Amino acid sequence: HHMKISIIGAGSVRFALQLVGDIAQTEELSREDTHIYMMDVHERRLNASYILARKYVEELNSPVKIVKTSSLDEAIDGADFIINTAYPYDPRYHDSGSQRWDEVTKVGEKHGYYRGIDSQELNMVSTYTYVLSSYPDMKLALEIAEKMKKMAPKAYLMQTANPVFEITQAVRRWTGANIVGFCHGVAGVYEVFEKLDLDPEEVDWQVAGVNHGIWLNRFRYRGEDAYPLLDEWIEKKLPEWEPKNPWDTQMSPAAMDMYKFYGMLPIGDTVRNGSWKYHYNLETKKKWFGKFGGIDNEVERPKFHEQLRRARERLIKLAEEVQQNPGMKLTEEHPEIFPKGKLSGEQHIPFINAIANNKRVRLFLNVENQGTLKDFPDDVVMELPVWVDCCGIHREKVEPDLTHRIKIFYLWPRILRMEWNLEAYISRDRKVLEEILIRDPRTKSYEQIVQVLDEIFNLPFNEELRRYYKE
Amino acid sequence: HHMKISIIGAGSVRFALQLVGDIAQTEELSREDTHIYMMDVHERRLNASYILARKYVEELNSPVKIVKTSSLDEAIDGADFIINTAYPYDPRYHDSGSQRWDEVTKVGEKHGYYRGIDSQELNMVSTYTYVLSSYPDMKLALEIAEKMKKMAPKAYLMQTANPVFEITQAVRRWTGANIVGFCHGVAGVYEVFEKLDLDPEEVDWQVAGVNHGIWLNRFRYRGEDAYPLLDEWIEKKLPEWEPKNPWDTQMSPAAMDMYKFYGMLPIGDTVRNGSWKYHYNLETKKKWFGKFGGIDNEVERPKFHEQLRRARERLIKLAEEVQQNPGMKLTEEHPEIFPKGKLSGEQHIPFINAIANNKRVRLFLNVENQGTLKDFPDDVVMELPVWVDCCGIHREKVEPDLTHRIKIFYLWPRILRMEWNLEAYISRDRKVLEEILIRDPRTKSYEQIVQVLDEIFNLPFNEELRRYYKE
């Protein structure tokens, strides 16, 4: 047979471009019998990705076949791998998923919720959830899961869209579907090693926890705990640390503070998901994250979404250029965006090449605990270090165990917040949403949460959201 | 041999009087070979309880022997049953345990924490915890547990002092000691049956959960769910409900609201331990609990502690009366306080008579889950329906199971808050206390929690508390 890899939401041009780049440069997958289905509902973006992708593989000399489609059934039918990177929205009001999150966040601030209703303790990550329930995004992943159990029973559903923890769990639990959560927050660990003058391949390390809630449980050098090297860095170097850009938080005072308390270093976006201690306002964010106040604020987030929008428009306009200039080479003209002989460092293609062609590799994926961390249920989805080959996912033993304080102060509260979000969705009940905000540290009255929720629900692009929560 | 029942903190005159009344009226325990050791550190109160108790049993014609002691070793040595009803304090500053709680609560309000630092979501119960850790009270129960493993290895430690959940758990886990938590919040259920015109002995019922967090999981009449009778009462009767006194909350709008959301009626002090929805201020408390705003407020609690103080002074002065008037009969002069031919309805003596003399009885006690509620760990202490005989405690099957919403919204959050409180104690670390308040919905800044904690720690009667948390 051939191999079908469907990318749902392929209008995310850059992420799709790095996926297509990775498969086209992977010797075992770069075959005539590899078919990439790019599927999306917004056609301007779709057509751009498609012509760019085709131009790109042409220049890598990859015989991979690329098929654009407009219908999700045709993309799912008989697929071997389904990558969901879709960010749903209503084209009558918006032109991008992030616009809707940006707007409910303004309504949330209007009613006294700084950084919006979706900014909660232990998840400050922007655009992670959408009105707690994430209805638009969860609805789509469950639609995909119902369609694929009929037309693609042997496929792996690779969840990339947020919230990955909530969605992966819901699909896993409510459908049978073979879903796996992907996220690459694990990469920040390489910055820790460099800042401590450590050859990365000479470090024995491990992380574990929950999506955007992972901890460096094992950090060793020469068979000895290397955490004293971090304690020394905190003494000497931290006083003069400074971020390169609003995303640079791994070695921040907020991270070191969380390290002091929990006993292990929080990795990647975990650092963004601290307690309210670091997030009361912009001035407080700047004390703990440096001059930008990190990425999750009034100034840097709208700035970032504006850059992202600006970039879509460009890639569309670039697609009109390759149409207009058949002869120009994308590898030469924009090598940043079309790398030759390098890999994205994303885990998606390594995963596919492992399962399809037995190229065994260590990955960090969101899968059911299944008794890897004993103090938590077997069915709860977690970000774990796993080995992947043609027999599927195999979990590494997690050693040392995560500290008591991580379990009771971080992980368990975060698991419950997920259980809260899933109950809100499944029950179709406003009361659950109200109860979530009743426990929000910035709720002043009950009247307040009723009025925020009302206003959010009455935004024109949430018409079907409020019809979902209608008595 | 004889039987030794030690009451630690016997200066709680009224509670001690009802204990001594219950044993003296229990046919199997009212023996010459039953010895009651009353022990306390404050001698004015001790002497009063002792002479009152002796006068009391004299009039019931109970041959029970009563021994006052000043030393806790002498009370614990060779004891069969040890009832801990002590509320520690410093006599150089205070004359009662509740004075210290009242004062840290004033300091908490001073710094913007309404009803004090110890009033947290899912525990509004006044005087339950003391500066989160409850150091004075936990220290004493662990001292008792270390002394009794040497001098009373076969004894049952009956915890009555608060916090019962935290203390019972800590002792259980950190020592071997055979501890069991007692609390009689289960009694409110009899008011529910009466208000619905139900013969109480014709109702098939059960409760379960956590101390001050119990739910009416089973409510049946004629082998049929009787919860529609509660739904009818809510329609017709609730609009005209009104409390008899600040403790009357079982049928309140707050209780019915919690019933609507969780699916089961919260029982006793559970009703006091709702979310902040019902507790923002006095005016909001009065909407949900009636004209008094319940018992946990600025007005009714100091009023209640003043009545309690007034009552101690009286019982002391009554003791000087029986000394002065040998001939007067306490049964006749104050029958409210010295009942003849009735039982307290407290579970303490039924328990003793069950274990000692095989008078089997159904009780609701705080013991280790041990897989009674499957979704929770085996070692966590919980308030469960149990049968008690001479072979010990036997747990009833809990059926139906508690609802999903109770588990994820009420019980699990409350278990974690306990785990937080125990970590604060065991670690001797202010940072844990800070982290608890970092998640308090009325914390505005980190500076705020540092200043509350500082001021609390610097109150003269907390000298040894702050030396316990000293760097």
Q: What is the 3-state secondary structure (H, E, C) of chain A?
A: CCEEEEEECCCCHHHHHHHHHHHHHCCCCCCCCEEEEEECCCHHHHHHHHHHHHHHHHHHCCCCEEEEECCHHHHHCCCCEEEECCCCCCCCCCCCHHHHHHHHHHHHHHCCCCCCCCCECCECCCCCCCCCCCHHHHHHHHHHHHHHHHHCCCCEEEECCCCHHHHHHHHHHHCCCCEEECCCHHHHHHHHHHHCCCCHHHEEEEEEEECCEEEEEEEEECCEECHHHHHHHHHHCHHHCCCCCCCCCCCCHHHHHHHHHHCCCEEHHHCCCCCHHHCCCHHHHHHHHCCCCCCCCCCHHHHHHHHHHHHHHHHHHHHHHHHHCCCCCHHHHCCCCCCCCCCCCCCHHHHHHHHHHCCCEEEEEEEECCCCCCCCCCCCEEEEEEEEECCEEEECCCCCCCCHHHHHHHHHHHHHHHHHHHHHHHHCCHHHHHHHHHCCCCCCCHHHHHHHHHHHHCCHHHHHHHHHCCC
Q: How far apart are CA A220 and CA A205, in angstroms?
A: 6
Gyration radius of chain A over CA positions: 22
Of A261, A413, A445, the CB nearest to B416: A413
Chain B nearest-CA distance from A68, in A, is 44
In this complex, is the C-beta atom of A114 within 8 Å of any C-beta atom belonging to chain B? no
Q: Are B253 and B278 in contact (CB under 8 A)?
A: no
Residue A400, Cβ neighbours under 10 Å: how many?
11
Residue B197, Cβ neighbours under 10 Å: how many?
8
Listed resolution, Å:
2.5
Residue from A378, A405, A433 to probe the interface with B (highest B Cβ count within 10 Å): A405
Whether A269 is a known active-site residue: answer yes
Of A121, A280, A438, the CB nearest to B277: A438
Asked if the Cβ–Cβ distance from A277 to B441 is below 8 Å, we say no
Of A408, A419, A435, the CB nearest to B420: A408
Q: How far apart are CA A295 and CA B328, in angstroms?
A: 79
Chain A nearest-CA distance from B231, in A, is 18
In this complex, is the C-beta atom of A166 within 8 Å of any C-beta atom belonging to chain B? no
In this complex, is the C-beta atom of A121 within 8 Å of any C-beta atom belonging to chain B? yes
Which chain B residues touch A413 with a CB distance below 8 Å?
416
Residue from A123, A124, A277, A471 to probe the interface with B (highest B Cβ count within 10 Å): A277
Of B404, B420, B435, the CB nearest to A423: B404
Which chain A residues touch B443 with a CB distance below 8 Å?
276, 441
Chain B nearest-CA distance from A279, in A, is 10
Chain A nearest-CA distance from B77, in A, is 36
Residue ranges matching CATH 3.40.50.720 in chain B: 1-85+329-359
Which chain B residues touch A442 with a CB distance below 8 Å?
441
Q: How far apart are CA B430 and CA B202, in angstroms?
A: 52
Task: Establish whether A13 is an annotated binding residue.
Answer: yes
Experimental technique behind these coordinates: X-ray
Which chain A residues touch B420 with a CB distance below 8 Å?
408-409
Asked if the Cβ–Cβ distance from A423 to B431 is below 8 Å, we say no
What tokens appear for B420 in the block? Answer: 């937080």
In this complex, is the C-beta atom of A444 within 8 Å of any C-beta atom belonging to chain B? yes
Which of A314, A274, A286, A330 is CA-nearest to residue A119?
A274
In this complex, is the C-beta atom of A257 within 8 Å of any C-beta atom belonging to chain B? no
Task: Establish whether B172 is an annotated binding residue.
Answer: no
Which of B42, B94, B41 is CA-nearest to residue B460?
B94
Q: Which of residues 279-298 of B touch A (CB under 8 A)?
A: 280, 284
What tokens appear for B93 in the block? Answer: 């500053």
Please, which residues have CB within 8 angstroms of residue A295's CB and are 6 or more apart in sequence? A126, A246, A247, A249, A272, A301, A304
Which chain A residues touch B419 with a CB distance below 8 Å?
408
What tokens appear for B471 in the block? Answer: 């760097």
In this complex, is the C-beta atom of B259 within 8 Å of any C-beta atom belonging to chain A? no
- Burial class for A142, CB neighbours closer than 10 Å (0-12, 13-18, 19+): middle
In this complex, is the C-beta atom of A438 within 8 Å of any C-beta atom belonging to chain B? yes
CATH number of B1-85+329-359: 3.40.50.720
The label of the residue with tokens 């924009």 reads A334
Task: Establish whether B312 is an annotated binding residue.
Answer: yes
What tokens appear for B462 in the block? Answer: 């907390």
Please, which residues have CB within 8 angstroms of residue A153's CB and are 6 or more apart in sequence? none
Q: How far apart are CA A251 and CA A265, in angstroms?
A: 9
Asked if the Cβ–Cβ distance from B280 to A445 is below 8 Å, we say yes
Residue from B439, B446, B449 to probe the interface with A (highest A Cβ count within 10 Å): B439
Whether A348 is a known active-site residue: answer no
Q: How far apart are CA A145 and CA B4, in angstroms?
A: 66
Of B408, B419, B435, the CB nearest to A419: B408
Q: Are B50 and B422 in contact (CB under 8 A)?
A: no
Q: Establish how many alpha carbons lie within 13 A of residue A358's alpha carbon, considering only the half-sphere containing its beta carbon.
A: 1
Q: How many interchain CB pairs under 8 A, A with B?
A: 67
Of A405, A441, A445, the CB nearest to B423: A405
Report the catalytic residues of B: 184, 269
